[PDB]
Amino acid sequence: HMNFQRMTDLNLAGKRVLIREDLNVPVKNGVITSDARLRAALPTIKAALEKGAAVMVFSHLGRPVEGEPKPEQSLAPVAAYLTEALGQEVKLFTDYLDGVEVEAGQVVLLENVRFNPGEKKNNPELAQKYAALCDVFVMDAFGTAHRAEASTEGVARFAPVAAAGPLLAAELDALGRAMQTPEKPMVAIVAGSKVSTKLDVLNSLSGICDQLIVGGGIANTFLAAAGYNVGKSLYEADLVETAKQIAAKVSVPLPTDVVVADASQINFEDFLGSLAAAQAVIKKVEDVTANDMILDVGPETAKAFANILTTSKTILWNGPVGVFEVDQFGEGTKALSLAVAQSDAFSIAGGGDTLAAIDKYNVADQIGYISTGGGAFLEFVEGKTLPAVAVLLERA
């Protein structure tokens, strides 16, 4: 367990509580198109209210230019959402840097922090103005924890008390359970188009994992590292030697069979289209020709991965093992998703492709923790020091 203060453990009676949330919702013509991020932050706001706190919520929205506010990036529709959802008037304040009025039991929404000069640069003066508004700072937005900014890092530095919200706390706990002395055997699944893009991820997990399952373009590069022909498969020739060294440092299981398509049927002007129309072929891993494209793992490999995942007691899931968007190259990922879900191992998943796989094969219930951290999620797995988490450690 890691040592930082948590909002839920604090008495907030009569205290001014400033909560950093991720309310960056998609907006079209002043209407919120998806409220998933809102429904996620709501229990935190309600918990603060049930504790007799005076709640201030602020957030970033879109990519506006600091000092040039535009209506299209205003949190106004979010304030209206919070009003209907909480049953009280949630006012939006546009000029709050020199003080904002809030009483016990009510909620105020401060305007987009991206409107404020010095925000991106973690300006000390701006951070102090933030901190002066509260008795307790609560960081509840993990997806932004990997950047050092005025509303995510600096405010925690100058606030009287700095703590982690329930969302952040749940994320760090789940990540710690997998990254800090996990129960062995520890297996991670790492997939993507390029080894280079997830190189730090691979090297980091190489030290933590007992076995390292790879998928997609990454898997093809490791496959080439084992001396096999990959034909016209997607892989990185310049990182074959690096993958080779990794496979020597940690156990990287290699497919015994694969699903390929012939490149004469692939038009990259419309890749997904020509992939669905193409003829899928199951072949032995050594029977791959010069014009072949590996697009999924075969039936035998899928069982082999499953046994590994059934035996492990800790799973980190970051990617599919084939182009599952098209069904004929999706059996590998379907089998993998079922293997992770039914393993008594504690399983943690992260990354867009992973979540898409979880949604498609309906195994969300059976995943230990599903992270929405994105880039922040990967940087933690990389072993890097997320600025927003580190300051919370210093203030706790």
DSSP 230-273: -TT----GGGHHHHHHHHHHSB----SEEEEEEGGG--GGGHHH
DSSP code, position 311: H
On whether the CB atoms of residues 290 and 325 are closer than 8 A, the answer is no
* Nearby residues of 95 by Cβ (< 8 Å), 6 or more positions away: none
**Token pair for residue 283?**
């072949």
State the Rg of the chain over Cα.
Answer: 24
Phi/psi of residue 18, nearest 5 degrees: -100, 115
Asked about 194 being catalytic, the answer comes back as: yes
On whether the CB atoms of residues 256 and 300 are closer than 8 A, the answer is yes
Residue 384 Cα to chain centre, angstroms: 15
Burial of 105 (0-12, 13-18, 19+ CB in 10 A): middle
**Token pair for residue 308?**
């590994």
Tally the C-alpha atoms within 13 A of residue 190's C-alpha that lie toward its C-beta.
28
Distances (CA, A) of 190 to 119, 207, 291: 34, 14, 26
Per the residue annotation, which of 14, 52, 67, 352 is the catalytic one? 352
**Token pair for residue 8?**
């839920």
In single-letter form, the type of residue at position 309 comes to L
Please report the sign of the dihedral spanned by the C-alpha atoms of residue 221, residue 225, residue 231, residue 237. positive
Pairwise CA distance, residues 108 & 82, whole Å: 9
Asked about 283 being catalytic, the answer comes back as: no
On whether the CB atoms of residues 161 and 155 are closer than 8 A, the answer is no
On whether the CB atoms of residues 44 and 12 are closer than 8 A, the answer is no
Residue 206 Cα to chain centre, angstroms: 20
Which of 108, 100, 115, 113 has the alpha carbon at shortest distance from 150? 113
Element containing residue 329 per DSSP (H, E): none
Per the residue annotation, which of 46, 147, 194, 244 is the catalytic one? 194
Per the residue annotation, which of 37, 129, 157, 334 is the catalytic one? 37
Which of 363, 271, 356, 365 has the alpha carbon at shortest distance from 319? 356
**Token pair for residue 252?**
């990287």
Which of 142, 199, 200 has the alpha carbon at shortest distance from 174? 142
Per the residue annotation, which of 39, 67, 375, 384 is the catalytic one? 375
What is the assigned CATH class of domain 166-384? Answer: alpha beta
Pairwise CA distance, residues 350 & 188, whole Å: 11
CATH classification for the domain delimited by 1-165+385-396, as one of 1.10.3720.10, 3.30.200.20, 3.40.50.300, 3.40.50.1260: 3.40.50.1260
For residue 101, how many other CB atoms are within 10 A of its CB?
10
**Token pair for residue 160?**
């009287």
Burial of 172 (0-12, 13-18, 19+ CB in 10 A): buried
Experimental resolution (Å): 2.3
On whether the CB atoms of residues 51 and 102 are closer than 8 A, the answer is no
Which of 120, 154, 136, 297 has the alpha carbon at shortest distance from 216? 297
Tell me the three state secondary structure of residue 18.
strand
Asked about 298 being catalytic, the answer comes back as: no
Distances (CA, A) of 146 to 26, 300, 370: 21, 39, 18
For residue 125, how many other CB atoms are within 10 A of its CB?
12
Residue 55 Cα to chain centre, angstroms: 27
Peptide bond into 26 cis (omega under 30): no
Tell me the three state secondary structure of residue 7.
helix
Q: Where are the domains positioned within the chain?
A: 1-165+385-396, 166-384
**Token pair for residue 140?**
């509840």
| CA angle in degrees (0–180, nearest 5) for 279-260-239 | 145
User: Are 1-165+385-396 and 166-384 the same fold in CATH?
Assistant: yes
Asked about 352 being catalytic, the answer comes back as: yes
Matching residue, tokens 């188009």: 193
On whether the CB atoms of residues 257 and 237 are closer than 8 A, the answer is no
* DSSP H helices in the chain: 36-49, 76-86, 124-131, 155-158, 166-179, 199-208, 216-225, 240-249, 271-277, 299-311, 331-342, 352-360, 375-381, 387-394
Please report the sign of the dihedral spanned by the C-alpha atoms of residue 374, residue 380, residue 386, residue 390. positive
Matching residue, tokens 């909002």: 7
Exposure class string for 270-303: b at 16+ Cβ within 10 A, else e: eeeeebeebebeeeebeebeeebbbbbbbeebbe
What strand order describes the sheet that includes 211-215? 211-215, 186-192, 314-318, 346-349, 369-370
